[PDB]
Amino acid sequence: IVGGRKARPRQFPFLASIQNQGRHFCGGALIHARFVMTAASCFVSTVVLGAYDLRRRERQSRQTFSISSMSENGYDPQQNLNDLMLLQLDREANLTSSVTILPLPLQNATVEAGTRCQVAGWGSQRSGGRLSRFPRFVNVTVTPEDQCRPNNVCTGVLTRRGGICNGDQGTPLVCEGLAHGVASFSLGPCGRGPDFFTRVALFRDWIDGVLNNPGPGPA
Ligand SMILES: *[C@@H]1O[C@H](CO)[C@@H](O[C@@H]2O[C@H](CO)[C@@H](O)[C@H](O)[C@H]2NC(C)=O)[C@H](O)[C@H]1NC(C)=O
Ligand SMILES: *[C@@H]1O[C@H](CO)[C@@H](O)[C@H](O)[C@H]1NC(C)=O
Ligand SMILES: [Cl-]
Numbered sequence: 476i477v478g479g480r481k482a483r484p485r486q487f488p489f490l491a492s493i494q495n496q497g498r499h500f501c502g503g504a505l506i507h508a509r510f511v512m513t514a515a516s517c518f519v520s521t522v523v524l525g526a527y528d529l530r531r532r533e534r535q536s537r538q539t540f541s542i543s544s545m546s547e548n549g550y551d552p553q554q555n556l557n558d559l560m561l562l563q564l565d566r567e568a569n570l571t572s573s574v575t576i577l578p579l580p581l582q583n584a585t586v587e588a589g590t591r592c593q594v595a596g597w598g599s600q601r602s603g604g605r606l607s608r609f610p611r612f613v614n615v616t617v618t619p620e621d622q623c624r625p626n627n628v629c630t631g632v633l634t635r636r637g638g639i640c641n642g643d644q645g646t647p648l649v650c651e652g653l654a655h656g657v658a659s660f661s662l663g664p665c666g667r668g669p670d671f672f673t674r675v676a677l678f679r680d681w682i683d684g685v686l687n688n689p690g691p692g693p694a
Contacts, residue, residue: 477600477666478637479613484527484536487595487610489577489654492523493562493645499529499606502596502646504577504654507686508567512577513645514657514673515550515560522562525573529597529608536573540564544691548681556626558659559673560645561685580653582679590617592630592650594658594670598643602665606642613637617650618669626677628656629669636666648672 491503491511503513503522511522525537544563551557568574586592595612599605615630615638623629628648632638639646639658648656648670656672675682 476594476596476598476607476611476613476638476643477640478632478634479611482595482610482612485573487612488573488575490526490595490610490646492526492529492597493517493520494523495520499597499642501642501644502598502658503562504647505568505574506577506579506654506682508570508576509564509689510686511562511564512647512654512657512682513560513562514558514659515547516552516555516558516659517645518545518560522564524568525571527609529606538568538574540566540568546685546692548678555660555671557673559657559675559678561682563689577647577649577654578652579679579682580655580676582676584676586617586628586650586655588617588619590650592617592648592655594630594639594643594646594648596639596643596646596658598640599665600640602641604641615648615670622669623671626674627659628672628674630672631668631670632666636664638666638668638670640665
């Protein structure tokens with residue numbers, strides 16, 4: 476996250492740290508006791524919930540999981556289309572003060588331009604920079620459709636540099652308490668704008684289908 480502020484422990488209790496061999500590479504959100512929502516672009520990884528400082532064990536706060544299955548709905552890498560993925564955890568996460576579920580918008584809900592949201596993550600402060608050991612967050616504003624695309628929800632900041640960066644991909648965009656977006660991409664210098672998030676409301680019905688039909692799918 477660029478142009479943000481250090482979060483306090485448990486400030487964003489739904490946050491997920493997706494790691495590869497213990498290295499954080501993407502963010503996500505717990506949207507169900509058994510599922511974490513992230514970006515398809517991000518994809519033996521593990522999912523870490525309840526984390527604060529990436530470099531600390533935090534045994535009494537963290538919950539770690541293996542991914543039992545992954546689901547996507549027409550993801551297209553070339554067009555950055557439908558960049559959304561659901562990771563089924565190896566078991567149910569326990570809901571604690573440090574691990575909570577982030578509610579979703581109803582199918583087709585909208586967020587008008589100018590709506591205030593927040594985005595939090597462990598991403599870097601500049602392209603190619605180091606990750607942030609603590610979670611950081613920034614206030615963002617939904618942009619005019621004209622600056623975005625139907626498949627996404629776009630935001631910007633008032634400052635010259637603020638928004639997502641390396642490692643924030645997959646982290647949720649939270650507006651009016653709901654996960655309206657999934658960090659997908661941003662072009663040029665991080666914070667320049669606008670940030671592109673997959674529009675979650677477009678996938679509500681599909682997500683529901685996944686949540687209600689747990690399992691690895693056809694074998
Ligand atoms: C997120 O935006 C909120 C809303 O403007 C910011 O909160 C304000 O901060 C200023 C300066 O610290 C205060 O004078 C106001 O009282 C605050 N408003 C409320 C009632 O909290 C907040 O600091 C922004 N956070 C970041 C990460 O941008
Ligand atoms: C959501 O909008 C699409 C596209 O306009 C429409 O075809 C679909 O029926 C809507 N879903 C519901 C639940 O309203
Ligand atoms: Cl809604």
